[PDB]
Amino acid sequence: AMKKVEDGNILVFQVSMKANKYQIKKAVKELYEVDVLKVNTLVRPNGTKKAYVRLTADYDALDIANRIGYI
Amino acid sequence: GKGTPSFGKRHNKSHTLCNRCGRRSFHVQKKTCSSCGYPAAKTRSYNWGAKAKRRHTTGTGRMRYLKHVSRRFKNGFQTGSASK
Amino acid sequence: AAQKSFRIKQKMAKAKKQNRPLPQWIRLRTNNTIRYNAKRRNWRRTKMNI
Amino acid sequence: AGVKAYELRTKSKEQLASQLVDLKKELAELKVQKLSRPSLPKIKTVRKSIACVLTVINEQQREAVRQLYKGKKYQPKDLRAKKTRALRRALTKFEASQVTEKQRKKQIAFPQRKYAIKA
Amino acid sequence: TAADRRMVSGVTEKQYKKGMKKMQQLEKNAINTQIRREIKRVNFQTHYRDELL
Amino acid sequence: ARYGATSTNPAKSASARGSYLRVSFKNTRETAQAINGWELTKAQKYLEQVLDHQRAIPFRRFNSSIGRTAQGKEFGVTKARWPAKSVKFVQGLLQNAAANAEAKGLDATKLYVSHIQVNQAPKQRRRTYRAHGRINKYESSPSHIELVVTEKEE
Amino acid sequence: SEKAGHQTSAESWGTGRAVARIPRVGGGGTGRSGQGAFGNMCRGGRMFAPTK
Amino acid sequence: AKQSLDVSSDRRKARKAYFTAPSSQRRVLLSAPLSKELRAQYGIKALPIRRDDEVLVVRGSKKGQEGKISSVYRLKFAVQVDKVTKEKVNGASVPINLHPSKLVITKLHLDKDRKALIQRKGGKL
RNA sequence: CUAUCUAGCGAAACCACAGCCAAGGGAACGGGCUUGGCAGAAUCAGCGGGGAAAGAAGACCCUGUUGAGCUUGACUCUAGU
RNA sequence: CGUGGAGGUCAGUGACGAAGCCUAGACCGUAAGGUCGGGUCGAACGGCCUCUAGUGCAGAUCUUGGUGGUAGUAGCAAAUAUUCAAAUGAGAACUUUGAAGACUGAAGUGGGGAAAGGUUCCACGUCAACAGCAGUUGGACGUGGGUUAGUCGAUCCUAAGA
RNA sequence: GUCGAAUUUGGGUAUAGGGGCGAAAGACUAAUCGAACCAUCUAGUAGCUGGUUCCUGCCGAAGUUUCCCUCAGGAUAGCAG
RNA sequence: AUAUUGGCGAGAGACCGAUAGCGAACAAGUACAGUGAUGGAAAGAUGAAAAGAACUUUGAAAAGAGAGUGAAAAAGUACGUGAAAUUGUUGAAAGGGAAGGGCAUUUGAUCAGACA
Ligand SMILES: [Zn+2]
């Protein structure tokens, strides 16, 4: 998932099971004060949900990951 | 052959998971389960299966509400604030 | 199957998390009669009927 | 270990509701450091602190709605008594103590008198 | 790396190896028990055809 | 860690042991009796000639319908074999008992393997699958080994 | 207990098999399924004349 | 002998009410006697043991070894004393699990809610 | 390609105790008993005489005051009409 | 005569070793059985007068558990076939690479899928067990990583039917 | 043997125990069918077969009479303690 | 006043003592088998305390031999005592198509006490 943060503007999160791609696009707007191009979603085989949200071309993914604190 | 060559043609399930007791008994063609009849109101239970009520009666589970009723009776179903 | 329902994917994801040995710090408690994980399934031996 | 509920009853409604968000901010940063540091035992206390806030928020709104329905004929089925279903469908102590006008005239004229046996 | 998760919480790197080798044997005697006891009444069929005469 | 009926003194001895070894019991027994009483320098020379298919191991007790051979003549028997897994586990203990008689101070020039016995370890089960749907046992026959070398006193 | 030993549903195998005529637990996949039941000679069975 | 019908004389009912006692009914189970000065000073026979009490041993192979209560391990029904220990062959010095009955209290870790506790047992200052 | 010999791996059926014959008598066809013939460790590959070899409380026959399938104008009833 | 428990008694025996178990050691009794020495072992147990019974085993194609002889034996023989060097390794008929030799031969031993399985996929460690020889390899063990949809399917509609 | 059809076959659905279904064999109905499987009444009943646990002492039989849907069994008389 | 083999809380026993007592003293209606109704086990004990064997040396390693802990590893997580079947080493003796047993003695081994 670090390859998706560094190459593309793709932030990867583990989201709660009841979220539906509008509650994730709006969460990253409200939590991180950014804009989101597009959210993708899969349900991991350990039964949790993983969301490939994607920042849009002027927000950078490395700066948001460093302000969060997982580098 | 009726044995080993005919056990190879078994790849279509006839029961699936029941929704009210959660075990593979919900028969798909009849659309009714067979350990407890699920589209029925009352659960399926028979006194000829005395053992098969031990596995399913009151007490084999969490008893999320019923385990406190014996304590609430002793104090007398009181309410309100507690104490000092 | 591949195209599967959600209430069997919810069941095989629980079986993934239960496909774990005993944690090794369990064997060090005071009255610890447990010695291994006896409910441990493997897809070769025991099919789960879900 | 962080918050203590006797110091949260005093704080007003909008002070709690901004304290609760400040705990959820701290809780979410702690689930980042857990990804990079194996043990993190402080995360127990922050998770028991948003429960202590939320039980104080709900404590006040149950109380404020109870005096809103105080003395009314009908209050909601969340503020009525959780006695068992057999007790709520039972006669009240006035309804059980209702006797006919003929059986009431008898009890005032010929009551059960107490007495002994010797003279 | 979840290998340090062991090293802070009881278990050592050496204690895991001698612990699992006991543990992988504690399941060995039980499966040797299951094969031995069941081997009497496992050939005991019900509806055998007897392909002779 | 007690041993068999060793009728020698422990002061001039050195011992080794193997337990739950997955060799065959009926072959490691006849290997251990081919070298009983011998000198240690001559048992080690002999036991690796077996691996080169000279000087076979004389099978005496567990020898029903094994094949006859010509290398059994020097023992006065007509049925001998060259068990390879058995001698590799007995060589591994003569090398361990000749390493404990250096650490105890004895001289390896006049050691002799005085007491050596094998036993029966707890078996290890498997299944074999027979005709008409039957299941039968398929077990290993493992063996404990004890071994005592001793200086030749008078 | 009056239902001690009479919990199982064991029916005797008959005589065409090469084992005694005691009632035997039916089924499979457990070690018990095949074993004797319902008797006093059996392990897990009754006692003779259960105390009343 | 027993005279009320609320107390049991059963073996099994009295060992299950010991081995599964909760960790606050184990507080009174782990009482310890006071020395023959504190019984004249305060006036009790025994107090429930507490961490950081100064204590003395009267039974066992560690007899007559003063110390201090370092931890009340009231899960193994044992207490541990520092300044006495057991030096392992590895070099570790694990402590010893004593029982509070085989001790005697010499210096008492006074406190509120223990100053008041001694007073309800008829004690003094 | 097996069998055969070797290295590794390694079961099962079966088994009162077991295993050389002749005649005798015997539950009327003995490996054992009785009288004779005799008889030398350990054994390997074959073999199908014997072990009334193994397989399964005879599937035939008889007995049971034991059943079941089926039939009819058997006895006693019955849905239906 | 022996056994599990009960009332009574011997102010019985016992951590200086009770019960058990072993013993081609001794003694008593017609016998059932009793007593003693030795070895082992570690926490309770006997004599006698009476009470009571879930009380004495060689068998029941007895029940459960355990173990043998057979026996290092029957055998591990369909699907054309393997060989050389090197590397790793304590260890190579069997793992990896290279060099040969071959086979399935486009109704394949190829590439995909529906059922069904459920993490077997993939990497890093590792060989106690499993892979009916082997093992350094593995669909095994240990830890992790991995499945992204406005257009692909479900969802929608009806069929025989529920 | 048949191989373009009374063909073969997937998935869906229908019919369930004295009932189903049958181009008919009493065939098939989950290795079960001249009546499935599971639990219960049930430890069904048996005039029939097998087994029936310590020692010593003293006494010690019967296979016969009569009746019985009686003849592998009972009652009764006998012998015995 | 009466009934109660379920529920809740108590007290008790000429009861059973891990093949017993409930199916279950233990992660037991658990693992596992069956499409399904249903069927359904096995499995308790180191020591007072883990003091669960630091260190040395042989081995590729498991392990071994020392050492050490302990009242005791003839208690080392395969852990109380540890019977028999069956098995190994050592010691004694016997052996022409079985072995075993009964009476009697020779020979070897072994045991013995009133007078000792
Ligand atoms: Zn259901």
Residue ranges of domains in chain F = 9-154
Lookup: tokens for H22: 């909760």
**Cβ contacts of F27 within 8 Å, gap of 6 or more:** F62, F81, F83, F85, F86
Distance separating alpha carbons of residues G52 and G41, to the nearest angstrom: 20
Asked whether the beta carbons of H62 and H44 are under 8 A apart, the reply is no
Residue showing tokens 């009151």:
B58
Tell whether D111 is within 8 A of chain E (Cβ). Answer: no
Interface contact D81-B69, CB threshold 8 A: no
Interface contact E23-C35, CB threshold 8 A: yes
Asked whether the beta carbons of D19 and D53 are under 8 A apart, the reply is yes
Distance separating alpha carbons of residues A7 and D16, to the nearest angstrom: 42
DSSP E strands: which ranges in H15-67?
31-33, 46-48, 54-57
Asked whether the beta carbons of F122 and F3 are under 8 A apart, the reply is no
Start-to-end Cα distance in chain D: 76
Interface contact E38-G31, CB threshold 8 A: yes
**Is the Cα torsion angle G47, G52, H5, H6 positive or negative in sign?**
positive
A13 beta carbon to strand J: under 7 Å: no
How many angstroms is C1' of L112 away from CA of H43? 72
Q: What is the DSSP string of F114-151?
A: EEEEE--PPPB--EEE-GGG-EEE--B--EEEEEEEEE
DSSP code for D6: G
- Resolution (angstroms) equals 3.4
Distance separating alpha carbons of residues H29 and C31, to the nearest angstrom: 20
Task: Determine the distance separating the centroid of ligand 1 and the alpha carbon of B36, expressed in angstroms.
Answer: 4
Structural element, H or E, at residue B26: strand B24-27
Distance separating alpha carbons of residues F108 and F110, to the nearest angstrom: 6
Start-to-end Cα distance in chain C: 12
Distance separating alpha carbons of residues F7 and F109, to the nearest angstrom: 22
**Cβ contacts of H110 within 8 Å, gap of 6 or more:** none
Rounded-to-5 percentages of helix, strand, coil across chain F: 30, 25, 40
Residue showing tokens 């002999």:
F46
Tally C-beta pairs within 8 A across B and C. Answer: 6
Task: Determine the distance separating the centroid of ligand 1 and the alpha carbon of B50, expressed in angstroms.
Answer: 18
Asked whether the beta carbons of E40 and C45 are under 8 A apart, the reply is no
Backbone angles phi, psi at G39, to 5 degrees: -105, -175
Q: Is H99 helix (H, G, I), strand (E, B) or coil?
A: coil
For the CA atoms of F118, F122, F127, F130, the dihedral, rounded to the nearest 10 degrees, stands at: 60
Among partner residues C24, C28, C35, which is closest to E26 by beta-carbon distance? C35
Closest-CA residue to H28 (of H72, H93, H84, H91): H72
Distance separating alpha carbons of residues G19 and A28, to the nearest angstrom: 73
Q: Please count the CA atoms within 13 angstroms of the CA of F6 that sit on its side-chain side.
A: 21
**Is the Cα torsion angle C41, C43, C46, C49 positive or negative in sign?**
positive
With CA of F128 and C1' of each nucleotide, the nearest comes out as: J132
Q: For chain D, which domains are there?
A: 1-73 (no CATH), 74-119 (6.10.250.3450)
Closest-CA residue to D56 (of D1, D2, D26, D11): D11
Closest-CA residue to F28 (of F81, F99, F71, F102): F81
Q: What is the DSSP string of chain A?
A: -HHHHHTSSEEEEEE-TT--SSTTHHHHHHHS---EEEEEEEE-TTS-EEEEEEE-SSS-HHHHHHHHT--
DSSP E strands: which ranges in H1-125?
31-33, 46-48, 54-57, 68-73, 78-82, 86-87, 93-94, 97-98, 103-107
G36 beta carbon to strand L: under 7 Å: no
Q: Is D111 helix (H, G, I), strand (E, B) or coil?
A: coil
For the CA atoms of B45, B46, B50, B52, the dihedral, rounded to the nearest 10 degrees, stands at: -40
Tell whether D39 is within 8 A of chain E (Cβ). Answer: yes
Q: Is F19 helix (H, G, I), strand (E, B) or coil?
A: strand
Q: Is H26 helix (H, G, I), strand (E, B) or coil?
A: helix
CATH architecture of the domain H1-125 equals Roll (2.30)
Distance separating alpha carbons of residues B56 and B61, to the nearest angstrom: 9
Binding residues of B for Zn(2+), as ranges, are 18, 21, 33, 36
Asked whether the beta carbons of F127 and F133 are under 8 A apart, the reply is no
**Cβ contacts of G8 within 8 Å, gap of 6 or more:** G25, G37, G38, G44
Interface contact D87-B69, CB threshold 8 A: no
Strands G10-12 and H103-107: unpaired
Distance separating alpha carbons of residues D39 and G9, to the nearest angstrom: 54
Tell whether E39 is within 8 A of chain F (Cβ). Answer: yes
Query: How many angstroms separate the Cα of A45 from the Cα of each of A1, C9, C11, D14, E24?
Result: 16, 8, 10, 41, 27
Q: Residues E12, E16, E18, CA angle at the centre, nearest 5°? A: 120
Distance separating alpha carbons of residues H117 and H27, to the nearest angstrom: 14
DSSP code for D115: -
Q: Is B65 helix (H, G, I), strand (E, B) or coil?
A: coil
Backbone angles phi, psi at F25, to 5 degrees: -70, -40
**Cβ contacts of F15 within 8 Å, gap of 6 or more:** F3, F97, F100, F146, F147, F148, F149
Query: How many angstroms separate the Cα of D66 from the Cα of each of D30, D88, F68?
Result: 38, 20, 103
Query: How many angstroms separate the Cα of H80 from the Cα of each of H73, H74, H94?
Result: 7, 10, 10
Asked whether the beta carbons of F125 and F138 are under 8 A apart, the reply is yes
Q: H62-86: string of b/e by CB count within 10 Å (b at 16+)?
A: eeebebbbbebebeeebbbbeebee
How many angstroms is C1' of K68 away from CA of D95? 79
Asked whether the beta carbons of A36 and A54 are under 8 A apart, the reply is yes
Which of E6, E27, E34 to mutate to probe the C interface, most C CBs <10 Å?
E27
How was this structure determined? It was done by cryo-EM
Closest-CA residue to G9 (of G19, G23, G21): G23
Distance separating alpha carbons of residues F102 and F111, to the nearest angstrom: 11
Angle between helices D49-66 and D13-33 (to 10 degrees): 160
Closest-CA residue to F39 (of F80, F97, F117, F102): F97
**CB-CB neighbors (< 8 A) of D32 in chain A:** 68-70
Distance separating alpha carbons of residues F88 and F84, to the nearest angstrom: 6
With CA of E48 and C1' of each nucleotide, the nearest comes out as: K31
Distance separating alpha carbons of residues G45 and D109, to the nearest angstrom: 72
Burial class of residue H103 in the structure, from the number of CB atoms within 10 Å of its CB (0-12 exposed, 13-18 middle, 19+ buried):
buried
B23 beta carbon to strand L: under 7 Å: yes
Start-to-end Cα distance in chain A: 12
With CA of E52 and C1' of each nucleotide, the nearest comes out as: I55
Distance separating alpha carbons of residues H50 and H52, to the nearest angstrom: 6
How many angstroms is C1' of I65 away from CA of B15? 51
Query: How many angstroms separate the Cα of H12 from the Cα of each of A39, C33, H15, H16, H19?
Result: 64, 21, 5, 6, 11
**CB-CB neighbors (< 8 A) of C50 in chain B:** 17, 24
Structural element, H or E, at residue D31: helix D13-33
DSSP code for H35: P
What is the total residue count of chain B? 84
Lookup: tokens for H119: 């007073």
**Is the Cα torsion angle B57, B59, B64, B68 positive or negative in sign?**
positive
List the domain boundaries for chain H: 1-125
DSSP code for D70: T
Rg (CA), chain H: 17
Query: How many angstroms separate the Cα of E26 from the Cα of each of C22, C30, C35, F19, G18?
Result: 12, 20, 8, 17, 36
Per-residue CB contacts under 7 A with strand I, chain F residues 49-108: 64-69, 78-79, 81-86
Q: Is F101 helix (H, G, I), strand (E, B) or coil?
A: helix
F24 beta carbon to strand J: under 7 Å: yes
Query: How many angstroms separate the Cα of D98 from the Cα of each of A61, D95, D109?
Result: 78, 6, 18
Tell whether E45 is within 8 A of chain F (Cβ). Answer: yes
**Cβ contacts of F37 within 8 Å, gap of 6 or more:** F112, F113, F114
Point out which residues pair with F148 in neighbouring strands. F15, F115
Distance separating alpha carbons of residues F89 and F140, to the nearest angstrom: 16
Tell whether E13 is within 8 A of chain C (Cβ). Answer: no
Binding residues of B, as ranges, are 18, 21, 33, 36
Closest-CA residue to D28 (of H79, H17, A14): A14
Query: How many angstroms separate the Cα of H61 from the Cα of each of F60, H33, H64, H96, H103?
Result: 59, 19, 9, 11, 12
